[PDB]
Amino acid sequence: PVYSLTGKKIFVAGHTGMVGSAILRRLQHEDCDIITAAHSVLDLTRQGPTENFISGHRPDVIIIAAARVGGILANSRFPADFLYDNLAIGMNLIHAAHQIGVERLLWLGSSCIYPRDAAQPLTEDALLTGPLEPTNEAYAIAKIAGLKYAQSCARQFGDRFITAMPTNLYGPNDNFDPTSSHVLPALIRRVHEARMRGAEPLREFLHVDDLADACLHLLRFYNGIEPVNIGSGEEISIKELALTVARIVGYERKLLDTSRIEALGWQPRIRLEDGLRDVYRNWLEE
Amino acid sequence: PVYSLTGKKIFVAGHTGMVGSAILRRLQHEDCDIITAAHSVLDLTRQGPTENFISGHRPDVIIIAAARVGGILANSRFPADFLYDNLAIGMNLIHAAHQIGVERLLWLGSSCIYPRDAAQPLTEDALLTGPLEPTNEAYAIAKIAGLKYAQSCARQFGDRFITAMPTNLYGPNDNFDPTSSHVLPALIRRVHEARMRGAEPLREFLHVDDLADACLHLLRFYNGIEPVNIGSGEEISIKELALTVARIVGYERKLLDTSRIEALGWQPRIRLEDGLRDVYRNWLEE
Numbered sequence: 001p002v003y004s005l006t007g008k009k010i011f012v013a014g015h016t017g018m019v020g021s022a023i024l025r026r027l028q029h030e031d032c033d034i035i036t037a038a039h040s041v042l043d044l045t046r047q048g049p050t051e052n053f054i055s056g057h058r059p060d061v062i063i064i065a066a067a068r069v070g071g072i073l074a075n076s077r078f079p080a081d082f083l084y085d086n087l088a089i090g091m092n093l094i095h096a097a098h099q100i101g102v103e104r105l106l107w108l109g110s111s112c113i114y115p116r117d118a119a120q121p122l123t124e125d126a127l128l129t130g131p132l133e134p135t136n137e138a139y140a141i142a143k144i145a146g147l148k149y150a151q152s153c154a155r156q157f158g159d160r161f162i163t164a165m166p167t168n169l170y171g172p173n174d175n176f177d178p179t180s181s182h183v184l185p186a187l188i189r190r191v192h193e194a195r196m197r198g199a200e201p202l203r204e205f206l207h208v209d210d211l212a213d214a215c216l217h218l219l220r221f222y223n224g225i226e227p228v229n230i231g232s233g234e235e236i237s238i239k240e241l242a243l244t245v246a247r248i249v250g251y252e253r254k255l256l257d258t259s260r261i262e263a264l265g266w267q268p269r270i271r272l273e274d275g276l277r278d279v280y281r282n283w284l285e286e
Numbered sequence: 287p288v289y290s291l292t293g294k295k296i297f298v299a300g301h302t303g304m305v306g307s308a309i310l311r312r313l314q315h316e317d318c319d320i321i322t323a324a325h326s327v328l329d330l331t332r333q334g335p336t337e338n339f340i341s342g343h344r345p346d347v348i349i350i351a352a353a354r355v356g357g358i359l360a361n362s363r364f365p366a367d368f369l370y371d372n373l374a375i376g377m378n379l380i381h382a383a384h385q386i387g388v389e390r391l392l393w394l395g396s397s398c399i400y401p402r403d404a405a406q407p408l409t410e411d412a413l414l415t416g417p418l419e420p421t422n423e424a425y426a427i428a429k430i431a432g433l434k435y436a437q438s439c440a441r442q443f444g445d446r447f448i449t450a451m452p453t454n455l456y457g458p459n460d461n462f463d464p465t466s467s468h469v470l471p472a473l474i475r476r477v478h479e480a481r482m483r484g485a486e487p488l489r490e491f492l493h494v495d496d497l498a499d500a501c502l503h504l505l506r507f508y509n510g511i512e513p514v515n516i517g518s519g520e521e522i523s524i525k526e527l528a529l530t531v532a533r534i535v536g537y538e539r540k541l542l543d544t545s546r547i548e549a550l551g552w553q554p555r556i557r558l559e560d561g562l563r564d565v566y567r568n569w570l571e572e
């Protein structure tokens with residue numbers, strides 16, 4: 001373990017988010033001091049307020065889960081917002097972290113910022129080797145620049161700043177809105193609406209609490225500069241995923257290469273059919 | 287002419303620079319109000335001071351020539367500075383410009399931010415189609431993100447923001463320091479040191495006052511979203527360039543595709559051997 005979190009003060013930016021809240025849940029267990037700021041009190045695109053907040057609380061560890069995220073229609077109609085919000089969050093936090101000597105920093109990239117036609121399964125060195133997908137190019141540019149700005153700080157100063165590249169996420173605090181772009185909630189939604197009515201391609205899915213655990217594992221064991229994929233490893237088809245969904249409700253590619261994270265001795269622990277059913281029931285309970 | 291500069295208030299950021307000062311010189315002729323801020327009074331990486339300066343002077347046109355520039359050794363040893371300084375300048379100015387409705391904005395890209403192995407001559411759609419040159423990747427990432435952030439504002443809001451992609455520049459206020467990375471001053475320097483001592487591959491070169499004129503031409507006639515190369519068009523070899531240099535002192539690829547700027551009716555006017563000799567003499571006068 002290159003670094004222990006116990007005793008450190010950790011800032012979890014975007015703690016109300018899907019990823020951020022999962023990191024907070026994993027962190028309630030550790031022996032540390034957690035530090036949060038609601039979106040309503042601290043806009044992380046504001047460089048002044050962000051620097052004073054970092055320079056005052058002086059955390060040892062920044063985990064950047066604050067972001068502007070959305071489906072394809074939002075990305076394509078609000079590119080300036082998706083580029084600026086995400087890029088200014090990362091620049092203001094990475095620069096603030098470098099100025100005061102923050103010991104560790106975690107920036108979050110994404111599977112959808114690799115080149116659109118990169119060979120599958122996607123290794124981390126596929127980054128920037130070809131054209132971006134146009135529909136979320138603006139989001140991707142923001143996440144890549146933050147990643148590269150973290151890399152340059154590690155290069156020039158030895159700042160221990162790293163980027164994780166997650167994949168599609170599911171689990172607690174997911175989006176079940178009828179306008180969600182998350183295929184998995186949408187299936188749980190559409191299949192449940194069918195069973196109660198009574199009327200009658202490969203993909204990856206990662207549980208958010210596995211992602212949270214992997215993010216802490218990287219913080220404790222990963223010292224490299226290059227980014228690290230956090231994938232599911234167990235894939236499934238839209239057809240097979242449909243069967244797994246309709247077979248819990250009662251109703252009648254995009255693959256990452258995870259060699260790097262596995263060489264650090266991490267692999268997701270929650271099974272798809274196990275996490276799905278746990279998500280089906282608590283959608284009902286509400 | 288889609289837009290006239292006469293009557294408008296134009297901010298020339300980085301007016302002390304090599305490009306910026308040339309734009310100022312071209313602008314002294316126009317009927318406009320020029321607005322400058324010395325680097326010493328306004329750090330354009332500071333979002334707060336930059337917004338208050340834009341929101342107070344309220345220019346109609348922002349020309350962004352402020353930047354952090356250097357040769358290969360600086361780029362490779364100070365990547366974080368070359369990424370952050372340039373990216374924060376562009377983000378703070380583009381966002382400030384969008385917030386108050388700045389009618390026109392010019393961001394400057396560069397020839398060295400195309401993929402390292404893109405087919406020559408480099409068309410503007412070669413951007414991001416392959417890996418960057420590692421030595422100035424950090425600079426390039428900054429210039430690309432600014433470019434794409436300008437593009438996204440034009441896309442989402444119709445902000446009339448454009449990027450020009452110049453090539454190697456020479457002319458007034460050039461760098462003749464013995465540590466200059468500019469090959470052309472270095473030859474003028476090395477060849478003059480030889481002639482007074484007495485002891486005895488293709489490239490492009492663009493005159494800075496041609497670049498300045500082309501930048502104003504784009505502002506007046508170019509409404510597109512995509513970037514526009516501003517190249518020399520007349521190329522020359524390191525061997526032939528050497529002959530042209532040693533044949534003024536008395537001593538004994540990287541090519542852009544300029545179709546787009548030529549379809550706007552612009553082509554550089556200053557001849558290499560004419561601008562060189564004009565630069566040889568005024569180096570002596572000092």
Ligand SMILES: NC(=O)c1ccc[n+]([C@@H]2O[C@H](COP(=O)([O-])OP(=O)(O)OC[C@H]3O[C@@H](n4cnc5c(N)ncnc54)[C@H](OP(=O)(O)O)[C@@H]3O)[C@@H](O)[C@H]2O)c1
Nearest residue numbers: 014016017018019039044066067108109110111166167168
């Ligand atoms: N396929 C993939 O690779 C993949 C998929 C999903 C996520 N991820 C990664 O995880 C990241 C987070 O995604 P998510 O699903 O957790 O998103 P999310 O649920 O929408 O969370 C965004 C969080 O950031 C906060 N926030 C937004 N703008 C802010 C601002 N200007 N200042 C401060 N806080 C602000 C939000 O606050 P509010 O409470 O105001 O909403 C919320 O807490 C993504 O950006 C991506 O890097 C990767």
Ligand SMILES: NC(=O)c1ccc[n+]([C@@H]2O[C@H](COP(=O)([O-])OP(=O)(O)OC[C@H]3O[C@@H](n4cnc5c(N)ncnc54)[C@H](OP(=O)(O)O)[C@@H]3O)[C@@H](O)[C@H]2O)c1
Nearest residue numbers: 300302303304305325330352353394395396397452453454
């Ligand atoms: N091959 C190519 O495509 C190529 C080649 C050359 C230039 N260009 C383009 O032209 C741009 C400008 O290059 P240049 O040769 O003119 O560079 P330069 O001579 O070094 O000018 C930089 C200017 O920006 C100012 N500045 C620097 N940091 C600042 C900050 N934080 N806040 C405010 N002002 C700041 C500098 O002020 P000081 O007075 O304090 O120095 C100077 O006025 C480049 O970035 C590039 O886009 C393209």
Ligand SMILES: [Mg+2]
Nearest residue numbers: 017018019020
């Ligand atoms: Mg989140």
Ligand SMILES: [Mg+2]
Nearest residue numbers: 303304305306
């Ligand atoms: Mg300049």
